[PDB]
């Protein structure tokens, strides 16, 4: 059955709630991202109206064959009126698409749903500025102070720097990006850019890349990966058997994978700097994991919530253990403590 957490009070609404089949009492459904833990349900079949940004619902026509009648995208920063109560969605800086939900409740209540969030101080100029918030329903992935990592921009130019560095070194370096979800696109990209390669990948990854709205798309990605030097597979191949057995696949144009995983942290990240990460290496294969968040840091997260000073703060992420739960409860109060809201 679903979770209060997912449930929005004194509305029709649900939000990322399409696992528990028909809700009892929702009149609309809201999908914060095109994420599989949060679009869990959905199809062809479904048959209510889903509420979303304009990339998501690009992706549920395409690749869940939802059906266009059912799918309503909205602008972002932009007051709409769903069922009677005005919502704004608000860029959430998670993968392409990803979205926050204000709702403006008919008796003067005002709620934020973060959905996947990276909070940035960027936030603090949206219309999220214009006027004060009683609730906060909060993404907490990364609710705890030894989750420190890096910018985005760091770590892309470690990638960079270091892609750019053996290729020029050896130009039959192949280097392979993994991926499993949308989301981190700029790590690849941002690769085939220094090298002036395309990115290769199945037409399957084509199709969803496409869906995306990114400008001068068909200019960065391709389906021939007998012309690109840059190749995607899927985050379970990325290991030193799958890679071994991809170089085969590739027929002697290659001599050496040089192989990035962009996972969100590790505790590598407790003791080491960016600049200072090496690769696991066997024979010509090497492997980096970077740390690429699309998640708040623990700093990130206190930031966002001392400056939103909401009356109360409803997590949505570790929620299923009472010890997490009471961790994340104790922060809270710090935060509001030190903060004197
Ligand atoms: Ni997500």
Request: glycine residues 6%; positive net charge.
């Amino acid at each position: 059955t679903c979770p209060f957490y997912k449930k929005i009070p004194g509305t029709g609404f649900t939000v990322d709630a399409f696992q528990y089949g028909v809700v009892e009492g929702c009149t609309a459904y809201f999908l914060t991202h095109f994420h599989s833990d949060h679009y869990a349900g959905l199809s062809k079949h479904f048959t209510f109206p889903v509420y979303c940004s304009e990339i998501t619902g690009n992706l549920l026509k395409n690749k869940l064959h939802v059906q266009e009648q059912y799918i309503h995208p909205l602008p972002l920063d932009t007051e709409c009126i769903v069922n009677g109560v005005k919502v704004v969605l608000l860029d959430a800086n998670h993968c392409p698409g990803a979205v926050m939900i204000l709702f403006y409740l008919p008796n003067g209540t005002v709620i934020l749903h973060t959905g996947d969030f990276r909070a940035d101080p960027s936030m603090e100029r949206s219309l999220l500025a214009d006027q004060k918030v009683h609730m906060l329903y909060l993404d907490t992935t990364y609710c705890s102070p030894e989750y420190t990592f890096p910018s985005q921009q760091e770590v892309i130019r470690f990638a960079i720097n270091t892609a750019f560095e053996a290729v020029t070194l050896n130009p039959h370096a192949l280097v392979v990006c993994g991926t499993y979800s949308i989301g981190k696109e700029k790590v690849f990209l941002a690769i085939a850019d220094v090298l002036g390669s395309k990115v290769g990948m199945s037409q399957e990854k084509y199709k969803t890349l496409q869906c995306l709205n990114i400008p001068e798309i068909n200019s960065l990605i391709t389906t021939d990966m007998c012309s690109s030097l840059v190749h995607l597979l899927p985050m379970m191949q990325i290991n030193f058997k799958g890679l071994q057995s991809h170089l085969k696949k590739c027929g002697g144009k290659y001599n050496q994978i040089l192989a990035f995983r962009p996972t969100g942290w590790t505790h590598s990240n407790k003791f080491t700097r960016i600049a200072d990460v090496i690769p696991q290496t066997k024979g010509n294969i090497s492997i980096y994991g970077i740390p690429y968040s699309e998640h708040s840091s623990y700093l990130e997260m206190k930031r966002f919530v001392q400056w939103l000073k909401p009356q109360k703060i409803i997590p949505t992420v570790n929620v299923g253990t009472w010890k997490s739960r009471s961790t994340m409860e104790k922060y809270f109060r710090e935060w509001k403590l030190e903060a004197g809201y």
